Symmetry: C2
Subunit: 373 residues, 2 copies
């Protein structure tokens, strides 16, 4: 007695067409330069209205005259979100980590660029809504904290698991997994300069320095910390990003989504290859019953899953519905299935380690029901 | 106001010489065959007495006639403990894991071989005790559970972290880290055949099947499980191993040691190469203060440590005082230093992941005091 992902998408796409019923089904031209794509794409659209952003894009590059439309969307997305230009950025220096608006941006990237990003993400959602002909998926692996800011949610420390592994593994886990009664931590963060000298302490709330982290307020600490690191340092960039987004897509429409659904709505169910999965996956622990009966039920159920559920699975265990550049062999920590000692419990995960905690199930049909996350 | 490792060693070596004052400082010959070293080494010594095991070994191989004594000790240790002959064995199919008497031995390995193992480990300890001239270190990476059985200690689930990672990671961690109030586990273990059919359930105590794992008896479960997996299945092999050990080394002498000290007494402080350490070590998380000031204090303190403390460190973070075959580049998970958010707390570790949890220290001298485990 509630709503499936597909239902939300149809409602969202319908509501969105109706928002633009009065916007025109006609043509508008862009001329862009592969050399400097972002800069030329901004200038191409500098004179456009909201109405113009609704019209079908006729893209022409210099040095070759639908084929270029797809090519433009592909490249513009990379240009913005691929982090080369450090407009977006990752917290972990791993080149498979998810991306986030730059907390401390080079001055040479104005806030107009974030607004443009939002218009572009807006346009992909909008064209995606008109039919299979016009579909444009966003080619980007966003942080959950960023997707959540788009929707309008409070930050929670769970977001660190996906957005700053180093930081979850190192500090958050420590705090969650230790007695705070013999540590003397507080509700401040100490910032240090390039070199490593304490330039300033920053209270997460008034008297934060005076307030010690107990075991009772441990969680209030961690989320005050989530607010600070993931959202507080990027208010401006996100505000402009969704000024742009909200021109084509009103914010109230996106409320019906959580962060992982919004990823699936923006970037699609992708194409995930059970053959690549089987090849670079890893199994850990479990009886002969697990190693032999459960894991073959698993791979059977897997080859019997919609492109949509295969993505729901990849997202539930790794953090994103999307594989990095190098497919399953690029996953930071290899996609792994750990045996739980339970029978007939809900399967769990640890997305920091790309780990799926698969109970030792008694029937094929119980594996099938449970891999339908 | 207690006793340093070195003090224990001197007491142990002195007490041990005095046990053999009346045993003779004369010669006895062995003739062995590299082809079949264990079998020929048994037959070489089949006729010997306890008294004979005290005498200096003159070893002759077939096909070349101190140089062979060292060579024999080197090879005999490998023959027993290197697990090729599956006399000893590892739980994890990783070829860097620690070794344990075989729970389910090929019939073609009699119990006399375990007794011989004990005599050999005995002899190494004994010759080691006479001086630098006679020193023979045991070349083996034993499970902590095995070292603890030698000393005469109860099994504790902590031993799984070092002895069966797969099993700690998969089952033990799960139980320690979850609410048992919504799982319905019990004080039994289910054994399955080669194929994967439930042949028999085994209660860890009377009515174990009837007794549910609560959050209150979670630990009693885990250690009853430690007894079962690490000790219960090898009573006979260990009994014979220390029949042999106790001929040259009375058991009461070894009581003054814990498992990690007994490893250092048997196998030495080895030779561990700060240059190899620096090269294949890994750092995770921490401020610029940590990344820049603390980690250089660390590597400084490291190059200023006795061979003995360097081993105490390697043991505290990886599980053994001894590197695998391929030096630091062979460590299952790379030797890693994680930043803790604390200042001036005792450094902690996770030996399953070869992880050292190094607080963010305020002085060089605080790093020095704390790396003296």
């Amino acid at each position: 007695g509630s709503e499936t992902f597909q239902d939300k998408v149809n409602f969202f796409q319908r509501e969105l067409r109706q928002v633009h019923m009065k916007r025109p089904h006609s043509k508008v031209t862009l001329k862009v330069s592969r050399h400097a794509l972002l800069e030329s794409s901004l200038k191409a659209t500098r004179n456009f209205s909201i109405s113009d952003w609704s019209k079908n894009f006729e893209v022409v590059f210099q040095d070759e005259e639908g084929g270029p439309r797809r090519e433009w969307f592909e490249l513009i997305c990379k240009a913005l979100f691929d982090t080369t230009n450090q407009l977006f950025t990752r917290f972990s220096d791993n080149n498979q980590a998810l991306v986030h608006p730059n907390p401390n941006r080079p001055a040479h990237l104005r806030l107009k660029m974030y607004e443009f990003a939002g218009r572009l993400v807006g346009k992909c959602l909008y064209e995606s809504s008109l039919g299979g002909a016009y579909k444009q998926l966003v080619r980007a692996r966003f942080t959950r904290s960023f997707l959540a800011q788009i929707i309008g949610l409070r930050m929670h420390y769970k977001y660190f698991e996906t957005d700053d592994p180093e930081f979850y593994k190192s500090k958050v886990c420590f705090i969650l997994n230790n007695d705070m009664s013999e540590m003397e931590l507080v509700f401040a963060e100490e910032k240090y300069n390039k070199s490593g000298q304490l330039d300033k302490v920053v209270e997460l709330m008034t008297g934060g320095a005076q307030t010690p982290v107990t075991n009772a307020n441990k969680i209030f600490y961690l989320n005050l910390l989530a607010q600070y690191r993931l959202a507080s340092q990027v208010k401006e960039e996100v505000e402009h990003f969704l000024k742009g987004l909200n021109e084509l897509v009103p914010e109230n429409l996106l409320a019906i989504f959580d962060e992982n659904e919004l990823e699936l709505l923006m970037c699609g169910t992708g194409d995930i290859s059970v053959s690549d999965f089987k090849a670079h996956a890893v199994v850990v622990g479990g009886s002969w019953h697990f190693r032999e009966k459960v894991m073959r039920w698993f791979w059977t159920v897997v080859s019997s899953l919609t492109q949509e559920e295969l993505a729901r699975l990849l997202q539930f265990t790794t953090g994103s519905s999307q594989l990095p550049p190098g497919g399953f062999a690029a996953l930071c920590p290899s996609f792994q299935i750990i045996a739980a000692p339970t029978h007939s419990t809900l399967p769990t995960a640890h997305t920091c380690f790309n780990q799926l905690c698969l109970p030792t199930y008694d029937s094929y049909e119980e594996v099938h029901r449970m891999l339908q996350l």
